[PDB]
Amino acid sequence: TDSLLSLVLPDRVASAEVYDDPPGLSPLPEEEPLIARSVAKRRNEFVTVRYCARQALGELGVGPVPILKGDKGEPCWPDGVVGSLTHCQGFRGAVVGRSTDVRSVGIDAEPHDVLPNGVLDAITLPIERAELRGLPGDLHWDRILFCAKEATYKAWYPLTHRWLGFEDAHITFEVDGSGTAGSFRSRILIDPVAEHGPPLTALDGRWSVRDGLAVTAIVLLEH
Amino acid sequence: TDSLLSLVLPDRVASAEVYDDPPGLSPLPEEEPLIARSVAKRRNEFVTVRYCARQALGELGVGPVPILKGDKGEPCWPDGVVGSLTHCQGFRGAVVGRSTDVRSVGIDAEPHDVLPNGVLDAITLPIERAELRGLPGDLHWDRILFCAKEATYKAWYPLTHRWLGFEDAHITFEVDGSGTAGSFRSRILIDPVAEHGPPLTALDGRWSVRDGLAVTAIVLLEH
Ligand SMILES: CC(C)(COP(=O)(O)OP(=O)(O)OC[C@H]1O[C@@H](n2cnc3c(N)ncnc32)[C@H](O)[C@@H]1OP(=O)(O)O)[C@@H](O)C(=O)NCCC(=O)NCCS
Ligand SMILES: CC(C)(COP(=O)(O)OP(=O)(O)OC[C@H]1O[C@@H](n2cnc3c(N)ncnc32)[C@H](O)[C@@H]1OP(=O)(O)O)[C@@H](O)C(=O)NCCC(=O)NCCS
Ligand SMILES: [Mg+2]
Ligand SMILES: [Mg+2]
Ligand SMILES: [Mg+2]
Ligand SMILES: [Mg+2]
Ligand SMILES: [Mg+2]
Ligand SMILES: [Mg+2]
């Protein structure tokens, strides 16, 4: 199934997702040092999300490869591929694309639960707090905003190798007729200069709440 | 030479350091994906610091192995080893120890320069700024405190897998008779629970300013 990510992804990318840890999955041998000292719940999400990533790579025509980690934990894709990984309670998902047409991917999944006390204040600009109070529907807008901030960081970081704080992007939401999905824009408030290619002044994505999960995706195209 | 790190390291660890990038050094094949998309100055520090790490491992009786990156970029050491890496303008250094007697290592090097405008206020508790004004010597105490905070994070993170912010530790310095080296204590202000072993309520290290560099080291022993 591509049920949940199909509601946020445009064309030019492949995806895979699961909602549990299939028993007895293994990392590739090359990946073993990344999780040798990890707690079992970290091991599980690492292994299961890379099973999803190798399925998605296969839909691109790319054979199963180790997916290692680099600067600040960013995934290391095979030559000619960009992508993003996510895992939370009840979700693992991977999205990949060819770097010939896709510049960056960021995705994130969150359980559709209220944020813990104090978290909203720590992740919002004043203006975002005002905006969220005006958004329609029985949704955890705090959590959806959090999910979109996380996807924004994952799409930004591989293009800049610079920190992007919660106060460094203003996220604004649009809501479709369903009331359970729509678009967002992340307007960058700091130096937008990329390592390669045009400045990152804004990143556009989609959000969707379904099956107890918020998902967000940003797919920035190569021009 | 072990010149600069010899002024901050206790027993039970091996180290290696250089002040430039020896030309023609290569990553090991397994490390290539971590720097395949990096800018040249990031490749250089990554490659040279792992040359230092493999020398230091050799001093421990450990053969040359890839040093990959895991959660939040932490280095991935061979079974039975802990350690820390640092690189800045004019310095690469690696410190390793056996996990049977060493629990964690965090090291950091900084150019001995004033911090850029605004950085001191972003990295200090109000009380720290007042204490730094009290410390003696023609030293960049702002930079030395920054260097010690970075070492604190590197020692902390592999034991907790939790964020530690600048405001989450109070560092206090003592100054030796030389006026150019001494001890510091990092008092943890958040939940100190470790994943394994006793709580991290405080981390003790040494600092040394020499040859235009600040170096810090924390070596937490296994009991
Ligand atoms: C990196 C971060 C965003 C991940 O958020 P999260 O909700 O825990 O995300 P998930 O657990 O669903 O996904 C983590 C995956 O993201 C990817 N990722 C991690 N660091 C990354 C980075 N620097 N760049 C790109 N992708 C990264 C990894 O593939 C990771 O999974 P893996 O370790 O199994 O390979 C978060 O830990 C973080 O550091 N936040 C601070 C920065 C931020 O949010 N800024 C706000 C910007 S507006
Ligand atoms: C990780 C951090 C401390 C590195 O500081 P820095 O001055 O850039 O350090 P250096 O470049 O000298 O050393 C980087 C090395 O530290 C190691 N390191 C990176 N992340 C690490 C982590 N989570 N845990 C342990 N070591 C880590 C790596 O080996 C890295 O080198 P490599 O990428 O070539 O392998 C910094 O980037 C950071 O994230 N700071 C915010 C957290 C913090 O400082 N809190 C204050 C605590 S009181
Ligand atoms: Mg699919
Ligand atoms: Mg996570
Ligand atoms: Mg998430
Ligand atoms: Mg030595
Ligand atoms: Mg650095
Ligand atoms: Mg440093």
DSSP per-residue codes, B90-112 = TEEEEEEEETTTEEEEEEEEEES
* Candidate from A33, A38, A72 with C-beta closest to B68: A33
Q: Are A46 and A35 in contact (CB under 8 A)?
A: yes
Looking at residue A121, its amino acid is D
Q: Which residues contact A185 (CB under 8 A, 6 or more apart)?
A: A171, A172, A202, A203, A204, A205
CA atoms within 13 A on the CB side of B114: 4
Q: Which residues contact A198 (CB under 8 A, 6 or more apart)?
A: A223
The two tokens of residue B18 are 């250089």
Complete DSSP assignment for A22-91 = -TT----GGGHHHHTT--HHHHHHHHHHHHHHHHHHHHHT------EE-GGG-EEPPTTEEEEEEEETTE
The two tokens of residue A84 are 């993003």
CB atoms within 10 A of CB B17: 24
Cα distances (Å, whole numbers) of residue A154 to A131, A162, A186, B98: 23, 11, 12, 35
Residues at CB less than 6 angstroms from ligand 2: B 46, 49, 69, 72-75, 85-88, 108-109, 149-150, 152-154, 157-158, 164-166, 168-169
Q: Which residues pair with A94 in a beta bridge?
A: A16, A85
Selected for mutation to probe chain B from A28, A31, A32, A37 (highest B CB count within 10 Å) is A37
Instruction: Determine the Cα–Cα distance for residues A182 and B24; give it in Å rounded to an integer.
Output: 51
* Candidate from B39, B70, B161 with C-beta closest to A34: B70
Torsion of CA A142, A143, A144, A150, to 10 degrees: 110
Selected for mutation to probe chain A from B71, B77, B161, B196 (highest A CB count within 10 Å) is B71
The structure's method of determination equals X-ray
The two tokens of residue B68 are 């990959």
Element (H, E) at A186: strand A181-188
How many structural domains does chain A have?
Answer: 1
Instruction: Determine the Cα–Cα distance for residues B131 and A45; give it in Å rounded to an integer.
Output: 44
Asked if B76 lies within 8 A of A36 by C-beta distance, the reply is yes
Instruction: Determine the Cα–Cα distance for residues B8 and B110; give it in Å rounded to an integer.
Output: 14
Ligand 2 pocket test target in B150, B152, B167, B187 with most atoms within 8 Å of CB: B150
Range list of β-strands (E), chain B:
13-18, 68-69, 75-76, 81-88, 91-98, 102-111, 169-173, 181-188, 202-210, 213-221
The two tokens of residue A52 are 């999803």
- Per the document, the length of chain A is 223
Q: How many helices (H) and strands (E) does chain B have?
A: 6, 10
Ligand 1 pocket test target in A48, A54, A76, A150 with most atoms within 8 Å of CB: A150
Q: Which residues pair with A81 in a beta bridge?
A: A98
Q: Are A155 and A84 in contact (CB under 8 A)?
A: yes
Looking at residue B188, its amino acid is I
Q: Which three-class secondary structure state does DSSP give residue A150?
A: helix
Pick from B121, B108, B120, B95: nearest CA to B207 = B108
The two tokens of residue A48 are 């299961």
Domain boundaries, position A172: 1-223
Task: Using a CB–CB cutoff of 8 Å, tell me whether B122 touches chain A.
Answer: no
Burial A83-93 (b: 16+ CB within 10 A, else e): bbbbbbeebbb
Task: Using a CB–CB cutoff of 8 Å, tell me whether A35 touches chain B.
Answer: yes
Instruction: Determine the Cα–Cα distance for residues A84 and A16; give it in Å rounded to an integer.
Output: 11
Looking at residue A187, its amino acid is R
